[PDB]
Amino acid sequence: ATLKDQLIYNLLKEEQTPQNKITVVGVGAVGMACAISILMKDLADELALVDVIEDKLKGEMMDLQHGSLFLRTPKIVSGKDYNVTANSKLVIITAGALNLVQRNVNIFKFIIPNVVKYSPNCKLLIVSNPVDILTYVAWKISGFPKNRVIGSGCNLDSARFRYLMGERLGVHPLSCHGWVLGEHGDSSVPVWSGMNVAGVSLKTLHPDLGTDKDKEQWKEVHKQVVESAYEVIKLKGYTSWAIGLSVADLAESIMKNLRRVHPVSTMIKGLYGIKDDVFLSVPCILGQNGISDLVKVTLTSEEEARLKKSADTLWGIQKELQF
Amino acid sequence: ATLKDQLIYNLLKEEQTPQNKITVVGVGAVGMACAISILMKDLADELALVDVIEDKLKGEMMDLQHGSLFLRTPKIVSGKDYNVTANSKLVIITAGARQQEGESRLNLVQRNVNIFKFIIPNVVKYSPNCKLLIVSNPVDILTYVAWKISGFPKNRVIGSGCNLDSARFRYLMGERLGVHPLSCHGWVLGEHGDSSVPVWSGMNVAGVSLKTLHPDLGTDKDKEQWKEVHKQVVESAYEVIKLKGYTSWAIGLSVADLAESIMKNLRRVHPVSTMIKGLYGIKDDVFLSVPCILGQNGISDLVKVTLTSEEEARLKKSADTLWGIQKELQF
Amino acid sequence: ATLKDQLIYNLLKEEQTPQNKITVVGVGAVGMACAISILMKDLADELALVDVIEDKLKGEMMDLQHGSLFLRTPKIVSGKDYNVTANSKLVIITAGARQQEGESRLNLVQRNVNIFKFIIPNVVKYSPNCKLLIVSNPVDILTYVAWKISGFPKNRVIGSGCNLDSARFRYLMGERLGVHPLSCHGWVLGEHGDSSVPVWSGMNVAGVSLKTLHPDLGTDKDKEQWKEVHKQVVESAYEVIKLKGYTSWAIGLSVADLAESIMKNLRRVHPVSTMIKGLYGIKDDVFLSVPCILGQNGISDLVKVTLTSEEEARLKKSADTLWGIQKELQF
Amino acid sequence: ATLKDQLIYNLLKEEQTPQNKITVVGVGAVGMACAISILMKDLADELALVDVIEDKLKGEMMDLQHGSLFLRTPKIVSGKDYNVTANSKLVIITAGARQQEGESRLNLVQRNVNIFKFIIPNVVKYSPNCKLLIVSNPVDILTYVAWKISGFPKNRVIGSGCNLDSARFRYLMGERLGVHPLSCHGWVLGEHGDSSVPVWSGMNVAGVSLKTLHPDLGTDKDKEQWKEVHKQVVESAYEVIKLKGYTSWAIGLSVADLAESIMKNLRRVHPVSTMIKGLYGIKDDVFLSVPCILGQNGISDLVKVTLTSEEEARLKKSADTLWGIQKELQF
Numbered sequence A: 001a002t003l004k005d006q007l008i009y010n011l012l013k014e015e016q017t018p019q020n021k022i023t024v025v026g027v028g029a030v031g032m033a034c035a036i037s038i039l040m041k042d043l044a045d046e047l048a049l050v051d052v053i054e055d056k057l058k059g060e061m062m063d064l065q066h067g068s069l070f071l072r073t074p075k076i077v078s079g080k081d082y083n084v085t086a087n088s089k090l091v092i093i094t095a096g097a098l099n100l101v102q103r104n105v106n107i108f109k110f111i112i113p114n115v116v117k118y119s120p121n122c123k124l125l126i127v128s129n130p131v132d133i134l135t136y137v138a139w140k141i142s143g144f145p146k147n148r149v150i151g152s153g154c155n156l157d158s159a160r161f162r163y164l165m166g167e168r169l170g171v172h173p174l175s176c177h178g179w180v181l182g183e184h185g186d187s188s189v190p191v192w193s194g195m196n197v198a199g200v201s202l203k204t205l206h207p208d209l210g211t212d213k214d215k216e217q218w219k220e221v222h223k224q225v226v227e228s229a230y231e232v233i234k235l236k237g238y239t240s241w242a243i244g245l246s247v248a249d250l251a252e253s254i255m256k257n258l259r260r261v262h263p264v265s266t267m268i269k270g271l272y273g274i275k276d277d278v279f280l281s282v283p284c285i286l287g288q289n290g291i292s293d294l295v296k297v298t299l300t301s302e303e304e305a306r307l308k309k310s311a312d313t314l315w316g317i318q319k320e321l322q323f
Numbered sequence B, C, D: 001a002t003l004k005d006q007l008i009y010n011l012l013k014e015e016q017t018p019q020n021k022i023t024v025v026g027v028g029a030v031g032m033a034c035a036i037s038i039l040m041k042d043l044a045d046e047l048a049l050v051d052v053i054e055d056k057l058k059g060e061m062m063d064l065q066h067g068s069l070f071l072r073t074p075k076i077v078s079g080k081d082y083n084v085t086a087n088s089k090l091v092i093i094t095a096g097a098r099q100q101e102g103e104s105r106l107n108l109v110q111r112n113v114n115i116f117k118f119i120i121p122n123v124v125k126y127s128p129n130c131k132l133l134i135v136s137n138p139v140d141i142l143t144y145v146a147w148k149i150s151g152f153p154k155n156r157v158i159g160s161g162c163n164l165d166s167a168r169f170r171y172l173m174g175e176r177l178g179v180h181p182l183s184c185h186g187w188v189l190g191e192h193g194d195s196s197v198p199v200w201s202g203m204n205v206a207g208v209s210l211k212t213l214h215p216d217l218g219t220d221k222d223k224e225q226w227k228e229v230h231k232q233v234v235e236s237a238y239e240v241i242k243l244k245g246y247t248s249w250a251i252g253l254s255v256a257d258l259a260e261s262i263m264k265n266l267r268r269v270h271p272v273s274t275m276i277k278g279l280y281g282i283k284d285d286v287f288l289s290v291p292c293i294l295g296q297n298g299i300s301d302l303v304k305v306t307l308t309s310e311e312e313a314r315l316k317k318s319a320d321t322l323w324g325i326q327k328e329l330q331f
């Protein structure tokens, strides 16, 4: 017989559907950082990568496979074809190119039907920008119920905010609580009322917190969050590590059904006086069926107005998109 | 009082010196993969990054910082100046010249030696008691160069060496056998890369020797062509370079595994490059990979592997070549 | 309206089923050790506990529940009714009667069998596709009993077997050699406990055979008495019982290690007890420990270890003795 | 030549003073649950166990050591003699007397003080620069006792305090809301146990205050009986003792969490007992739980929680009671 047959007696060949599979579509710096963080957190028993650039895709796959000794994910696959994504619990989209929106919409027109073909019951986690519009696009094309379409939204915005908060206060980010919500990016909203350490509201201690009458200009913290993005791009040409970690954290709650609360993009129709089909970030409960619940944050009139304004602009763009 | 003073009462401001600090020098693809893997394994209470390209360095540092909420390493710093690296337990060198030969009129050994000539004395100044882990290529020559320049004892200079080679070999082995690479044991030793040596006699699952079951294993007589497994390790390197331009994930995962044994004083055995004088008839100051016991003192012990005459000749040939090059170096 | 509804808007309500449920049956010293180890390794999204002592059961459940903040296992349930165990991927049996003064091990067997006659049908009823992992003693016999009663295919019935014997062996080996047990390879096989078999030919560090290096290894001629290392494994069992009244931490950790490979489909190789009829000249339905590949279908494969004549005779002796007891058991 | 020397060439004969060492004193259920949790979280490179019952102590150590293969804490030691504890970064005290039927919790204190009179000077003798983490009950008084006997600055003496109460509370809150305890924030402060104070104003999910949404939160007139949640925290303590005879898993898990912030200098905020003189009109040397920042120097900062008038009155009453007891203690 072969060496393998001399060495190993087989009891059954009966291979099985992968039980905890995750796919990452798009193997740019963002997708691969998602891949590595997911791998080192032992969240999946199979990982699939998809891209249109065949060379890089094989390269990244092999590089990951070569680390198998140090991981606990026994099967890593990749391909142009979506048959490699079959039976994913979680499919994470990081692929992408106003005109930029239609191009990413056209990309999604190809990706989403393929993903849905091979993992009809998967959850979709959208990272591609602009994330709130593209979460809408993903939801529209897939036909999935809203709970199964999660946009990264303000997850990154909030993580950066809490890092910066932690810096100012001399406290680990984990113990510095604060929510950045609404539209991901430039137009996000820092909810000053919720900012606290150990349940001590900073706004209560300092009622001018985050206003232009704030002596300490905590507004700058939120502004630093947005400038940070442009700076990191200017400094190294892309962003990778932080988004990747943030995405793996969402994957963790979902894959392990933790029901933790995260700032992610979800259908916000019916809230804050919004009536259109737009996705915005609120704190959501994440688990095996995706977003099952959301927290009803009390917003001020000014905060509601910002959210409302974002929704109007997003719908303005969305209604003109060609599917 | 400020909002900070209203929220927080301070007991003292003393001290603040890191207990488990790690430094990565050279934040390219390899360095940053080492960094992320180390952060996600909770090996350090502090991570420092150094490079000569100031913008990239700052961007990379910020990016890692922005992920703080998802990590347990509370302080990440960076700078051109080595003062950020002070009091490191472990310093990892992944710096090196660009691939495009036209960037310089010197060859890679020369360029990377001049780079080490700049890096090593500055690391030593600020972390005299650190362990040095050398990744940069050619890794065996450069581990020797780090040893010569640092003045460190042998145990405190560790070359990545055949750690990646072995990790790749076990991956491919696990694929042929249908067994996780953790349970597929096999050692690739000697000179890192093209000239590495797969030690057939030690390849086993559960203490059952593959060479014993299948005596043609590794020979040209072998009908299953197991020699090709080692050949595939070498080809993999060049293929991944062609496909994506560099390698990062595997090497970075492999470096973190060494850092784990070192930072936690595990005394696990890894295939890494160490001063090999005294073994295999090798009488020169050369570094080659053999299985080494890694802990808080670096390489405290090495395993004396019984090699075949061929295997021994290959290691000896590598030592001859390496020393041939090294003897002409100017410090 | 409740504060819950004031605070939280529900999107959908459907009760979902756990995707990675594990049951522990018997919440004595061993059971709870397995539980805490499984909780701390993030292996399950749901943990169920089952016992017949109702107050202890509830208390153990509550105590675990109270650490939820520091864990990532969202639901922990308990009850004497096996409906709490529905759809477990893995069911660990650690239930066992207490051996009385003047009671022999032979006598104990039938008492543990009677316990299994109640437990096994209930398990199979609510989780017909689970992997059964048997810890209860004498473990090789009770693994057979579990297999008999359940009607399961042999791949889904796993005895803890020589997994603990092997962990203790490798710990002692590591102490002798000054190497982490992770890097000290060695297999204790056959019948768990007193009659287990240390396979000298497979002991190695970095693939370097200790027996090749030291031919008298494990024989009476051995000046270093390595045979006493196996003897210490056996004596250590009795000594821990004598000192603290039971063994818990080591067994719990060893069980979590197996659980990890099973739940994560790792295909690592472990020394566990499996149906070995057809090997080593054994014709009887008996379970003994060989290295097995563990994944989501239990034992998909086993490694065929090359045993010396003495080693085979010792396994065959165990099989004859085990069968001799098994033939007289009342099911 | 010994087999070890044939197999292994030694580079240097070691050995560094312990670098990341933890001692646990008292190996009852609490101490051992702290031990296993610390071990499974890779917080220390050396662990030491102390107790006055020698066989139990030895057995527990052997049991942990036997699990080494599955751990990454390479040195585990124990002894009645405190030299085993030398150079610990962190020493965790879980030793205490058995409270006898009909004994007041009053003179229980002094019995425990007598234990500390022996323990504390011994700890200081061998690790004069450690942090003390006190678990033994009544924890706020015994933390004061360790402070006085040790001579340590207040930053280096930490009481487990309301850490467990808060973890139970957040579990219960998480149950009601259908949210993971990690996302359910809420602080139980003051005196550990019966007289602890649930701080209703800080209780929140995602920064949304439950007290603001629900003004009756914490009152008797509250239709939803949220006050019962804090009541259940204290009732669950007596209930767990009634059902299983002791508590272990949750306290163990909570202590490891504190240990993690200390050993890794995380500067996370925890509800633990600290010397509170100067706050809340408290004018005596007493230790009560407030949110503290924990890192390498123990408690470096504390969060100044805004308390209501009757929350303040509750802390002050505990202070008065605790002090009343302490000033009668014999050292």
Ligand SMILES: NC(=O)C1=CN([C@@H]2O[C@H](COP(=O)(O)OP(=O)(O)OC[C@H]3O[C@@H](n4cnc5c(N)ncnc54)[C@H](O)[C@@H]3O)[C@@H](O)[C@H]2O)C=CC1
Pocket: A025, A026, A027, A028, A029, A030, A031, A050, A051, A052, A053, A094, A095, A096, A097, A107, A110, A111, A126, A127, A128, A129, A131, A152, A153, A156, A157, A184, A238, A239, A243
């Ligand atoms: N939501 C958030 O907080 C953040 C979102 N992002 C966004 O993530 C996206 C990706 O970022 P990068 O990796 O830096 O971009 P990238 O351009 O480096 O990577 C994009 C990848 O998508 C691939 N791709 C394009 N069309 C495809 C198709 N039809 N099928 C499969 N793959 C396809 C490309 O080949 C490319 O490899 C961007 O849209 C970026 O703006 C980035 C950071 C944060």
Ligand SMILES: NC(=O)C1=CN([C@@H]2O[C@H](COP(=O)(O)OP(=O)(O)OC[C@H]3O[C@@H](n4cnc5c(N)ncnc54)[C@H](O)[C@@H]3O)[C@@H](O)[C@H]2O)C=CC1
Pocket: B025, B026, B027, B028, B029, B030, B031, B050, B051, B052, B053, B094, B095, B096, B097, B098, B099, B115, B118, B119, B134, B135, B136, B137, B139, B160, B161, B164, B165, B192, B246, B247, B251
């Ligand atoms: N030993 C092994 O198994 C492996 C070794 N390598 C080697 O690792 C090295 C790095 O790999 P890559 O990340 O792809 O190279 P890279 O060019 O992408 O990164 C090198 C970094 O070193 C920096 N650097 C140059 N001079 C410096 C100085 N004086 N001080 C500080 N930093 C300096 C550069 O600015 C650059 O950022 C290469 O030599 C490569 O061959 C790569 C894979 C495996």
Ligand SMILES: NC(=O)C1=CN([C@@H]2O[C@H](COP(=O)(O)OP(=O)(O)OC[C@H]3O[C@@H](n4cnc5c(N)ncnc54)[C@H](O)[C@@H]3O)[C@@H](O)[C@H]2O)C=CC1
Pocket: C025, C026, C027, C028, C029, C030, C031, C050, C051, C052, C053, C094, C095, C096, C097, C098, C115, C118, C119, C134, C135, C136, C137, C138, C139, C160, C161, C164, C165, C192, C246, C247, C251
């Ligand atoms: N294979 C191995 O390496 C090892 C096996 N063991 C075995 O594990 C078994 C238990 O060990 P310990 O936890 O120390 O004993 P233990 O007495 O502390 O725990 C046994 C538990 O089994 C429970 N039980 C009895 N009948 C039951 C039933 N019908 N349903 C559910 N639960 C039931 C008891 O109530 C008790 O709680 C013993 O048989 C022991 O020999 C122990 C150590 C190692």
Ligand SMILES: NC(=O)C1=CN([C@@H]2O[C@H](COP(=O)(O)OP(=O)(O)OC[C@H]3O[C@@H](n4cnc5c(N)ncnc54)[C@H](O)[C@@H]3O)[C@@H](O)[C@H]2O)C=CC1
Pocket: D025, D026, D027, D028, D029, D030, D031, D050, D051, D052, D053, D094, D095, D096, D097, D098, D115, D118, D119, D134, D135, D136, D137, D139, D160, D161, D164, D165, D192, D246, D247, D251
């Ligand atoms: N602060 C908190 O939140 C909690 C505190 N506790 C307390 O922790 C303490 C221990 O709990 P258990 O482990 O269940 O008690 P236990 O009585 O089972 O264990 C106590 C151990 O301390 C040892 N000991 C006694 N005197 C000693 C000495 N001079 N030196 C060294 N060791 C000595 C005993 O020998 C015994 O093994 C108790 O006081 C208990 O009240 C328990 C749960 C929670």
Ligand SMILES: C[C@H](OC(=O)Cc1ccc(Cl)c(SC2=C(O)C[C@H](c3c(Cl)cccc3Cl)CC2=O)c1)c1ccccc1
Pocket: A129, A130, A131, A156, A157, A160, A184, A185, A186, A187, A225, A226, A227, A228, A229, A230, A232, A233, A238, A239
């Ligand atoms: C939405 C985003 O622009 C913004 O609103 C700025 C902003 C503010 C606050 C935060 Cl937290 C982030 S996270 C983040 C991104 O979302 C992408 C950023 C980026 C990339 Cl990947 C590439 C080119 C430019 C940029 Cl700003 C990097 C990066 O850090 C981004 C955008 C970028 C490109 C196309 C469309 C929209």
Ligand SMILES: C[C@H](OC(=O)Cc1ccc(Cl)c(SC2=C(O)C[C@H](c3c(Cl)cccc3Cl)CC2=O)c1)c1ccccc1
Pocket: B099, B108, B137, B138, B139, B164, B165, B168, B192, B193, B194, B195, B233, B234, B235, B236, B237, B238, B240, B241, B246, B247
């Ligand atoms: C030592 C190496 O050449 C070899 O012998 C080929 C080889 C065989 C077997 C293995 Cl396991 C590896 S690991 C590995 C490297 O060491 C670097 C490789 C590489 C890079 Cl980073 C850049 C350009 C070319 C190459 Cl081959 C990538 C990669 O996968 C590499 C070398 C590369 C550049 C300069 C000097 C020497």
Ligand SMILES: C[C@H](OC(=O)Cc1ccc(Cl)c(SC2=C(O)C[C@H](c3c(Cl)cccc3Cl)CC2=O)c1)c1ccccc1
Pocket: C105, C108, C137, C138, C139, C164, C165, C166, C168, C192, C193, C194, C195, C233, C234, C235, C236, C237, C238, C240, C241, C246, C247
């Ligand atoms: C199989 C076992 O006896 C042996 O053969 C001795 C032995 C040798 C080597 C190893 Cl590694 C172990 S592991 C182990 C056990 O399996 C149970 C031991 C034990 C318990 Cl829990 C209770 C009473 C006595 C014992 Cl020996 C503790 C313990 O450490 C045990 C047995 C016990 C009771 C009934 C029937 C059989």
Ligand SMILES: C[C@H](OC(=O)Cc1ccc(Cl)c(SC2=C(O)C[C@H](c3c(Cl)cccc3Cl)CC2=O)c1)c1ccccc1
Pocket: D099, D105, D108, D137, D138, D139, D164, D165, D168, D192, D193, D194, D195, D233, D234, D235, D236, D237, D238, D240, D241, D246, D247
């Ligand atoms: C301070 C404590 O009494 C209380 O106030 C009750 C209480 C209320 C709320 C919480 Cl969170 C806890 S945590 C906890 C303990 O601290 C010990 C408890 C306990 C043990 Cl270990 C043994 C006998 C009785 C008890 Cl109540 C168990 C347990 O869960 C305890 C005490 C117990 C014995 C001696 C002296 C003081």
